[PDB]
RNA sequence: AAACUUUCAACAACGGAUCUCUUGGUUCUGGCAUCGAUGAAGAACGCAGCGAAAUGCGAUAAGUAAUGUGAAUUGCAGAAUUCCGUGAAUCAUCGAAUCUUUGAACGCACAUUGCGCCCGCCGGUAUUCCGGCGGGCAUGCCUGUUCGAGCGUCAU
RNA sequence: GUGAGCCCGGGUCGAACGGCCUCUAGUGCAGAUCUUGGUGGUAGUAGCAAAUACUUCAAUGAGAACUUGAAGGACCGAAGUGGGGAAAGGUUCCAUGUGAACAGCGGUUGGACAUGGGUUAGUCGAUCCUAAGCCAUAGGGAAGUUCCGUUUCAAAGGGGCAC
RNA sequence: GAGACCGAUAGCGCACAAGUAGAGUGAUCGAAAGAUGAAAAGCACUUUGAAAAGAGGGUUAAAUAGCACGUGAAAUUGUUG
RNA sequence: GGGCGAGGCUCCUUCUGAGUUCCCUGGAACGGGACGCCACAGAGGGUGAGAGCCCCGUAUAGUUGGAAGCCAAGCCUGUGU
């Protein structure tokens, strides 16, 4: 599906001293919050070059 | 209160002098019906209601 | 006891059905007090009393509606609950007569030159 | 508060009636997967949000 | 090989239908063969099993045990046969579930609905054999 | 309970003057008097006529409000309107 | 004092319960629902929130009348009873 | 010469339904033939000459016969479309051939 | 059967007791990696904490 | 020498990878046209003998009628079914009904289970008082009816 | 076998899998302050030190510093560590019972867990009134969602009498 | 109705009481989580413990399958050599 | 201009072939071996392990019962205001 991996609200936390610059799921109160998104190396992300 | 006293009169031939009502924490209504001094509430509970 | 079948109900009239409904409601009202006072096999009886009350009310409503449909059989305007439901658009649709009405010129042309049955030799 | 509207009290009544553990006979049914009340509420843990 | 477009050979859909079938479908699913004597008497191969039938177990560890059907547990897709039981830890008797396709019916529980079922199945069988012959 | 207001119950609800009855029925005076004679609506006398109408005099005619309500359903009203 | 000390002054309510949609999104001073847009006649929805549309779209609730429509269509919106059926 | 500078992926039309659409068209043709039997499935068309100097060497089927052609053949214009003849009132006969 | 039901009710609590929840109504998911502690830099002007 | 640290092995832990499974997704194809003032979609509150949820349902409330099938349901309890039958069932179908408070939402309102108006019926001593029950009362516009207004144009 | 690897033995295990020739790809990891999950050393370590303070006997109990009764010693010191309310919470209130989990120790105790019970009004509030303010109507804008308007450039209705 | 698609970190966010639990004043954000066994046959009875449990002794084809449950890798740990 | 209409089609309904034969392993044959049978059916699924013949279904013509429509070979009649 063309929307797979992209039905999430996520933004990078920027260059810093602690964590990598992958976009992370915003909000709070759940396990998904702060987790990496949209990447082909990310769990529950979008695959590289999705099949058409 | 008027409906409660009419229903008591229709169901059990019960005459009341006053009826107090409250709404319980679980959402059902509780009614205290004080009977006329001639009748006996213990007799009514023993015979009509079976509350012994 | 406490189980009333619909087969005997379908032959009664309104007065007997109302009288039966009054009895069933009375026994259910007493049986609820007996339930909250003690536990037994009378919970089956309260369940059958509830279903019998439902059956009597259903039969009464059906007989009333049958009588009302017979009363409104030959009338132009009917109650809305007695009118057919279908859908809203189906109700708003043009009737078949109005949809099949044609002009007089079209009727003359169709009368004298309709689509013919024919075959072509090979 | 002690002062409350009827609508608010009705919602509180429904919450009070929902607040319970599951009956123990639920676990003995054929093919049961319910082990506890996963929607159990406590007055110190999660707000009703009214 | 299936031909008709309304027939599906999907394993997923077939297993979903089998394990979520309602009770009236599960009755037909829980069919059992008749014995040789009953087959030659009624011209019927199989029938849905029911409580009160007498069966003989022909598969499993309880083979060659006979008894009346005491329960048709359609929720578990299993029947209970009298004296085909085991002991629990405490020694109390618990029935052992037998699938109906592992038994053979030796004596039918006969009532007029069952005779109607047998008669219409038999009549269909002879009609089909006569038409194909 | 909520406090009742004065003049909202009792004889004020029980009686109606001829003017109020005519305006309630939306009739002319001859039609109203004709209908009252034909249906047996009789004049009534309240104990205190000021409680019913503060401008009422000794020659004010009163009727029962329930009688005028009963007159509202008389089929002769539509006959009057059809003839007009 | 803009953090922990200031959070102690939070005891009012911007939003109450909406009568139409049930959420705690009815602005108590504007009398306008942030979620469904009550008391406007239309239900509030936007194409930039596919998730919010799918949270409240048809089928997410009970479908009390609409779920019976395909069966009535399949049988042709018929009326009456089966021939020889018991009844009045 | 690659025109892929718009959002072209939104408007890609694949044609996996080509055999299914052929089957649907053949079923519709069979239904139309069964409904129209014993009449032919199509209407009679005239012979016309293609326009322009590129294609005027070749003749093909036209839309419908002219009113002058129907008159010279003795077929009335109201009878003609009811016996399988197509009629075109726009076309004229500029030449006798 | 009552003993079996009670044992099943007690055995349903093992994962939540290992997670050390205060009953089944304790379903709080805490922030293990808060953004205010794991993002941004400490500049020379105003800081976010003391 | 032991202990300690490290290395190698066996067993036991920790943890949930691997393998096998799949009533689920994903994509393609084929068929169909059917929401709502005759009150929809959505929301709230309730309903089971023993349920919090999911499911089903609406005070006729895990359901009524009708049709079909033909002996279950099942976790416990309690009852079955005249089994040669107006008939079990958390069955299937579904044309007859019921369908709380709401919501386009419609007497006026609603952060209130607030306040009304009209017409009937019933009950309590009741011409006056009190109570219950039933049916109604939104807006824009169309067609018609009836009641009107204006030296606006006239006739007499 | 140079090698990536291949094959066999032993143990464990429980339902499928492999060789060869072609076809096909979401096909080969040590790194990306990766992604998710799990686990170490640090380490039985840093601490568990504001709010003056605890002690004796008996009972309960498997077990008592933090349970109870009695006996003492102290503190709040009426701008209270007291007696009641508004907001907010929603059963935390009361009785009985209790394994684990929680109460950064301990627990026989508990706002924890389990089963029940508890909130009674003509006179107390709401309900009524208007305040700052907000929204319909007439009417005028605006492609439109809608905007202004709240007394207006509105036929915006009450009463009485009558042979 | 199907597939040279995916096989529980994959495939829809969701194979499960998933747009749920949870978070946010709000608009909105949004998970984790499948598998005992053919059949519960889910351990009678004895014994030690306050209990949880332990040991015998059965059940099973197998408990080297004990509702922490198919298989049970590595990191890391205990004992033994 | 009217009215019949044989017949056909569409949709629900009743019904359909053949091993649980003997031996071995196994807790359980649905495994191995032998002897058969059905097949317009050897698609799929279930049943205590790989089942055409144990069960549901699968193929094919038809065959019970019912309702509403549509098409249609032909056949009766009025005749020109
Ligand atoms: Zn809303």
From Swiss-Prot, chain I:
The lineage of its organism: Eukaryota, Fungi, Dikarya, Ascomycota, Pezizomycotina. Involved in the biogenesis of the 60S ribosomal subunit. It comes from the Eukaryota. The chain holds residues 612 to 661 of 661 of the full protein. Belongs to the TRAFAC class OBG-HflX-like GTPase superfamily. OBG GTPase family. NOG subfamily. It is found in: Nucleus, Nucleolus. Transmembrane segments: none annotated. This is Nucleolar GTP-binding protein 1. It comes from Chaetomium thermophilum (strain DSM 1495 / CBS 144.50 / IMI 039719).
